[PDB]
Amino acid sequence: MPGTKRFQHVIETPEPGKWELSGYEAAVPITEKSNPLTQDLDKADAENIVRLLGQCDAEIFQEEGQSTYQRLYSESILTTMVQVAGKVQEVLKEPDGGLVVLSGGGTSGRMAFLMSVSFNQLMKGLGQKPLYTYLIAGGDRSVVASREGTEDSALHGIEELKKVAAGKKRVIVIGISVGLSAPFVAGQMDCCMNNTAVFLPVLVGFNPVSMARNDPIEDWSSTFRQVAERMQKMQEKQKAFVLNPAIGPEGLSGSSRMKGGSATKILLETLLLAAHKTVDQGIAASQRCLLEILRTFERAHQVTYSQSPKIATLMKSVSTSLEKKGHVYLVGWQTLGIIAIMDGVECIHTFGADFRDVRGFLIFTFSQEDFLTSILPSLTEIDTVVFIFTLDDNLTEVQTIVEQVKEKTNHIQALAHSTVGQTLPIPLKKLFPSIISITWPLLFFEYEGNFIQKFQRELSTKWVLNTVSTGAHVLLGKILQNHMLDLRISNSKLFWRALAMLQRFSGQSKARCIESLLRAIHFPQPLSDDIRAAPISCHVQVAHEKEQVIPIALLSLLFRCSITEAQAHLAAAPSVCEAVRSALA
Ligand SMILES: CC#C[C@H]1CN(S(=O)(=O)c2ccc(N)nc2)CCN1c1ccc([S@](=N)(=O)C(F)(F)F)cc1
Numbered sequence: 001m002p003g004t005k006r007f008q009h010v011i012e013t014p015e016p017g018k019w020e021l022s023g024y025e026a027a028v029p030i031t032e033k034s035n036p037l038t039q040d041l042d043k044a045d046a047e048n049i050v051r052l053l054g055q056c057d058a059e060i061f062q063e064e065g066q067s068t069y070q071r072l073y074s075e076s077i078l079t080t081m082v083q084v085a086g087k088v089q090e091v092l093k094e095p096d097g098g099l100v101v102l103s104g105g106g107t108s109g110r111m112a113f114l115m116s117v118s119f120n121q122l123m124k125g126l127g128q129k130p131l132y133t134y135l136i137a138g139g140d141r142s143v144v145a146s147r148e149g150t151e152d153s154a155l156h157g158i159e160e161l162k163k164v165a166a167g168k169k170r171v172i173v174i175g176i177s178v179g180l181s182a183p184f185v186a187g188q189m190d191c192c193m194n195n196t197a198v199f200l201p202v203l204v205g206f207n208p209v210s211m212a213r214n215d216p217i218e219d220w221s222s223t224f225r226q227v228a229e230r231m232q233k234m235q236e237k238q239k240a241f242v243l244n245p246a247i248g249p250e251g252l253s254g255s256s257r258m259k260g261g262s263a264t265k266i267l268l269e270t271l272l273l274a275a276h277k278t279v280d281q282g283i284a285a286s287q288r289c290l291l292e293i294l295r296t297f298e299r300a301h302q303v304t305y306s307q308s309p310k311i312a313t314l315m316k317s318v319s320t321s322l323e324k325k326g327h328v329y330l331v332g333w334q335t336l337g338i339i340a341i342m343d344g345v346e347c348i349h350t351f352g353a354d355f356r357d358v359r360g361f362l363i364f365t366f367s368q369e370d371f372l373t374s375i376l377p378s379l380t381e382i383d384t385v386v387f388i389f390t391l392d393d394n395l396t397e398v399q400t401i402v403e404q405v406k407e408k409t410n411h412i413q414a415l416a417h418s419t420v421g422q423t424l425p426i427p428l429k430k431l432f433p434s435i436i437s438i439t440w441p442l443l444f445f446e447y448e449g450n451f452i453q454k455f456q457r458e459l460s461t462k463w464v465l466n467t468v469s470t471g472a473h474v475l476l477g478k479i480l481q482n483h484m485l486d487l488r489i490s491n492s493k494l495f496w497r498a499l500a501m502l503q504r505f506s507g508q509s510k511a512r513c514i515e516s517l518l519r520a521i522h523f524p525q526p527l528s529d530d531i532r533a534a535p536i537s538c539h540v541q542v543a544h545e546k547e548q549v550i551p552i553a554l555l556s557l558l559f560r561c562s563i564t565e566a567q568a569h570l571a572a573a574p575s576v577c578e579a580v581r582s583a584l585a
């Protein structure tokens with residue numbers, strides 16, 4: 001029937017109360033799962049939220065139980081990390097002809113970029129040619145834009161890979177897809193397997209291969225799952241690898257920018273750093289060198305989240321500035337600045353928030369006086385500015401910019417990383433009466449730039465900014481239980497996520513939910529057969545331009561009414577959030 005080709009794979013809605021026993025829940029990829037710790041997130045206060053997300057992030061480091069999924073600390077995963085470090089060594093010994101590519105869509109692509117830079121520095125600080133590069137769905141501009149649409153083409157991913165792999169003789173392709181989902185990566189991995197003599201693909205993500213995405217890619221014949229299963233078979237001969245620890249669901253369902261991007265770093269910085277630091281020691285990377293790093297990264301979570309109350313406050317003051325209708329600025333130096341930008345930009349698609357709502361800034365790259373003259377004029381009593389720096393940074397360039405902002409603002413707070421026994425110039429740096437001093441132990445680094453110190457600092461910031469940004473929006477009431485209902489369908493995964501949220505919250509059949517969704521998307525046109533049968537990219541291209549598509553669809557379902565009637569009902573409610581919330585009653 002028209003549509004069946006497209007919607008066949010979708011699991012039926014279960015009857016009330018049989019969501020577990022239908023086997024439905026056991027088939028939701030871990031990355032899409034609702035996290036039980038966050039079922040009441042929409043009611044938690046700011047301090048709760050910080051605790052719950054703190055807890056969620058902790059699950060990255062939790063160990064495997066006694067029938068269950070491999071995790072980060074499991075032997076199979078660490079053993080895989082060792083082998084892979086092994087393969088990076090082969091290339092590090094033979095840079096003439098060698099390349100290492102880190103690739104992903106969205107936040108996986110952001111993380112890819114950061115890491116490509118860091119390990120490029122490391123080899124430069126040693127006067128080796130850099131061997132690392134990145135790829136991001138939608139080319140380099142994607143790094144700092146919201147561009148959720150660009151991950152849906154395998155042919156794209158393969159092209160970007162063909163470019164950068166020039167006439168290199170040995171390429172290592174680390175494809176990052178938290179959900180084992182992005183068609184962009186799928187093409188890259190599949191290409192590599194078709195040319196083993198040059199390419200070595202390493203797939204990274206956080207679902208078991210049996211939960212890997214399995215719907216058809218529009219421009220490609222194989223699914224992510226087949227690709228991944230085939231890589232796993234090649235692992236027995238050491239010509240492909242799959243690194244896929246479970247780290248548990250996101251605190252905000254399907255928000256893989258969070259735990260997923262963090263685990264992406266934890267996992268890859270660990271493994272590559274190991275490979276580097278053990279080559280010039282003339283010694284294979286072992287689990288013991290990796291574990292050192294993982295435990296460091298695990299200390300870092302505890303270090304970070306012990307500043308919880310102060311974190312909870314910054315959230316409260318980001319919430320307020322947006323609750324009024326102010327803006328929030330995230331101002332940071334070197335790499336921490338970048339990560340500030342990345343968090344801000346992600347708030348656009350993740351929350352439907354405007355690019356001014358939470359904006360990042362590096363000294364987007366608007367330098368000292370340029371910030372003084374450009375952005376400074378437009379500050380306001382009710383805004384919030386956030387400063388993010390180490391003590392190694394240049395605190396003159398910092399004190400000046402804060403000195404200025406104090407006048408036009410007063411809601412300033414800061415994020416200062418420091419070795420122990422570094423002191424904060426101006427004992428009246430108050431200015432900041434209640435800093436977020438994150439003071440690090442002294443660790444035993446040997447490479448010139450102290451790269452482990454860097455990775456700690458990045459991760460810790462990411463955790464803070466993510467927890468803050470996400471938290472602030474929850475407090476505003478924009479999140480439903482632990483789901484972002486009112487997302488903008490801008491790729492096929494978000495289309496599927498929308499459909500799943502309609503089944504979840506309404507309890508109504510696969511076919512009704514699909515119908516209401518497609519009606520909501522294409523209104524005022526009605527369901528033709530062409531539309532039913534149309535590929536998911538056609539729905540996406542039309543929905544991406546609309547507002548409240550999902551809430552309208554859900555309302556049509558709950559009231560069993562037309563799109564005309566549910567739109568009218570929406571417009572006559574005080575807000576989207578109350579309309580939906582009380583239709584659920
Ligand atoms: C329809 C449907 C569905 C699934 C799978 N889609 S997906 O894009 O096809 C996908 C994405 C990743 C992956 N590994 N496999 C499949 C992504 C969204 N997804 C999903 C999301 C949430 C839920 S959920 N547990 O019902 C709740 F929304 F409440 F979390 C269930 C399924």
Ligand SMILES: O=P(O)(O)OC[C@@H](O)[C@@H](O)[C@H](O)[C@@H](O)CO
Nearest residue numbers: 106107177178179182255256257
């Ligand atoms: O790494 P994945 O599963 O392939 O997802 C890639 C991107 O869709 C994803 O990073 C998304 O942009 C983020 O908003 C998730 O919160």
